Amino acid sequence: EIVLTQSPGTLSLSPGERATLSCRASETVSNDKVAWYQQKPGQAPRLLIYGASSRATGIPDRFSGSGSGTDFTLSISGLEPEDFVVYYCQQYASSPRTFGQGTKVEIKRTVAAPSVFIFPPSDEQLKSGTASVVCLLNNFYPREAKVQWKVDNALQSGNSQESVTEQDSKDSTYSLSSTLTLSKADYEKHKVYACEVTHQGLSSPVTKSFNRGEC
Amino acid sequence: VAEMNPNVNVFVPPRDGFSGPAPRKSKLICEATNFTPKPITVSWLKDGKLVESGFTTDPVTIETPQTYKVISTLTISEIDWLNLNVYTCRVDHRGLTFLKNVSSTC
Amino acid sequence: EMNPNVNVFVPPRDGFKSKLICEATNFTPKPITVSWLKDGKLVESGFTTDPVTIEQTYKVISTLTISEIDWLNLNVYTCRVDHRGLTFLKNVSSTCA
Amino acid sequence: VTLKESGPTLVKPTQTLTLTCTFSGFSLTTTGEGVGWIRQPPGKALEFLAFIYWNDAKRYNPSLQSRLTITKDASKKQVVLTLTNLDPVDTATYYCARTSGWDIEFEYWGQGTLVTVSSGSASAPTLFPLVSCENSSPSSTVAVGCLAQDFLPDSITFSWKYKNNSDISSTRGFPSVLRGGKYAATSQVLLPSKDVMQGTDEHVVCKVQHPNGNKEKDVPLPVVI
Numbered sequence A: 001e002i003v004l005t006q007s008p009g010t011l012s013l014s015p016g017e018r019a020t021l022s023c024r025a026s027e028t029v030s031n032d033k034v035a036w037y038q039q040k041p042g043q044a045p046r047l048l049i050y051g052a053s054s055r056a057t058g059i060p061d062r063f064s065g066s067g068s069g070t071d072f073t074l075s076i077s078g079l080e081p082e083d084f085v086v087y088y089c090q091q092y093a094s095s096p097r098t099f100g101q102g103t104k105v106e107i108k109r110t111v112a113a114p115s116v117f118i119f120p121p122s123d124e125q126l127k128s129g130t131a132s133v134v135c136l137l138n139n140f141y142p143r144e145a146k147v148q149w150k151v152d153n154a155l156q157s158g159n160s161q162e163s164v165t166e167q168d169s170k171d172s173t174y175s176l177s178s179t180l181t182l183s184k185a186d187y188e189k190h191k192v193y194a195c196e197v198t199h200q201g202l203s204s205p206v207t208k209s210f211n212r213g214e215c
Numbered sequence B: 001v002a003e004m005n006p007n008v009n010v011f012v013p014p015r016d017g018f019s020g021p022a023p024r025k026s027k028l029i030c031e032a033t034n035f036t037p038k039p040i041t042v043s044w045l046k047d048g049k050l051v052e053s054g055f056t057t058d059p060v061t062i063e064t065p066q067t068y069k070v071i072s073t074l075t076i077s078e079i080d081w082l083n084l085n086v087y088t089c090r091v092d093h094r095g096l097t098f099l100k101n102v103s104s105t106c
Numbered sequence C: 001e002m003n004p005n006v007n008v009f010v011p012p013r014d015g016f017k018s019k020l021i022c023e024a025t026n027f028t029p030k031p032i033t034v035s036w037l038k039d040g041k042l043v044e045s046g047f048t049t050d051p052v053t054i055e056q057t058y059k060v061i062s063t064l065t066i067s068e069i070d071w072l073n074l075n076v077y078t079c080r081v082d083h084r085g086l087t088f089l090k091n092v093s094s095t096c097a
Numbered sequence D: 001v002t003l004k005e006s007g008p009t010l011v012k013p014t015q016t017l018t019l020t021c022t023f024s025g026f027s028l029t030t031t032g033e034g035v036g037w038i039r040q041p042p043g044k045a046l047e048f049l050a051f052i053y054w055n056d057a058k059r060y061n062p063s064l065q066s067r068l069t070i071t072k073d074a075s076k077k078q079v080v081l082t083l084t085n086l087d088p089v090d091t092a093t094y095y096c097a098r099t100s101g102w103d104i105e106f107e108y109w110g111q112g113t114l115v116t117v118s119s120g121s122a123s124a125p126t127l128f129p130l131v132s133c134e135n136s137s138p139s140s141t142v143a144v145g146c147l148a149q150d151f152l153p154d155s156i157t158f159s160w161k162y163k164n165n166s167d168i169s170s171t172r173g174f175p176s177v178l179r180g181g182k183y184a185a186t187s188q189v190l191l192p193s194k195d196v197m198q199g200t201d202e203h204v205v206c207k208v209q210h211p212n213g214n215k216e217k218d219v220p221l222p223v224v225i
């Protein structure tokens, strides 16, 4: 059992610069049989380098591998917009083999203030016994953001899944959606529902709330 | 939250409301208050002819249903007023047209 | 430093309560005080002053609430404008009288 | 060299799951060549299931030992994978690849197939109107959305049209999340404020193309002007 840990999980680079990916193994690998893979969301993963030193057919020469033993580093010269995908390091000397956590590289951009909108549940949806309150964040950077739900001054926990979209192809920003789920009987026992959004580019937190019956 | 028909009021200068070099000129004020929703169209009519110049409409400002107010000013000539010309303020609100007619006749 | 123009508007001859509008335009500096008078007596309530807006020239308007009976009884209403130590008084009356 | 996967798109928990990896253009006769299965749950990394070498040599993962079986049929040139004791947390997309020697591992990858393990049934999606309750802050533009709920499997495309059947470019698509055995997704659209204070159209239609029904509910605009 060879445990592979990759760090950092997310790194922000710029086009044309150099990116270094680190791969940490829990023990030495015989014959340095470590390979790197490239995977794009939607499509299928593709092999880039096998054995950490030999490239494969149809792979540009700008990808270079180095290191041995328990330390391996992947260097890429001439970073391209199409190269902002997730990369995994894998070793095939274990039998059975193991895969690493993987690291994601994003395009570095400036901090933009997000937009917060909340949609109260519709009357038709309330008839089904389920109420869904949403909290939408759009056009913010970096991806790291905190979304907390506060209803009647009581902080909620253990009831938010949280969905986040991928980086925009033309805007390079991120968006996420937070959904509040509660029982219909519990919904009628609360008046004000609000989600708090905290951002690096905001001096003070901005809170939005609505009054039951006015929407 | 509510739908209310706008109220149309027209202000006219008095007999001594004209000054300046001859020919003297004055202004007409048409104000709509206690109307909802916020959007509203204000137009000026002179003896059935649309006025396309010499008028300035102030932006709508906020004065429990929400209320708004709008102020419009049209420059008029003393000679036209003396000819018993009738000025009509055209107000459009949610597809409804309200007209008010004023004149110097007693 | 230019003296502000004083104009007082009156309700239409053929009918409309109503409001009285006193306008001061092309005045400088921006600070200006506008008040209302009724038959030579100070008015303590029933009047409001709108914030001064930009038409450099400025425009300020005032609103006075009056009743139909009082206005048509030939009562004297005067708009008082104070600017740079000068006081301007404008008197209006019924035209059809 | 290419590979193609195939199998059921919906399987109940605690049952038998069978997948077939269809490949053509090579034979498992030379040494070093082998076939392996790699799965990846959404939001997670790749997971190694098993690998089979030539001469009927197979390897299994100790974490999943005594739970998977590897069988090969040279007549049909396709490996057969059997999965038992299905669990909702094990839902992932399964891929198969060919190793061209001892050093070149997984040189060619196929396309994969989504195998959803949910106790529920493939019911038609349910739409719910969403009206923004924002106040005291008109901001740049207004936001209106569409809540597609109770759909399985997750395959939905969103298109926005006006009342006069116009075209809108939203491109705002949020991924689905497994909540209570069902996938839930949210979709929104941004429209200019000037258009709202213009045409009399007070609502727009939300359209979803799911292979369980062609319903399309309309969301009424709040209108600000």
Ligand SMILES: *[C@@H]1O[C@H](CO)[C@@H](O[C@@H]2O[C@H](CO)[C@@H](O)[C@H](O)[C@H]2NC(C)=O)[C@H](O)[C@H]1NC(C)=O
Binding pocket: D162, D164, D165, D166, D194, D195, D198, D199, D201
């Ligand atoms: C459907 O109605 C909308 C009204 O909301 C039309 O949008 C207007 O027309 C222009 C030209 O297409 C658009 O670019 C603008 O968004 C709207 N005009 C203004 C002044 O805001 C839309 O065009 C109509 N659809 C079709 C096919 O004509």
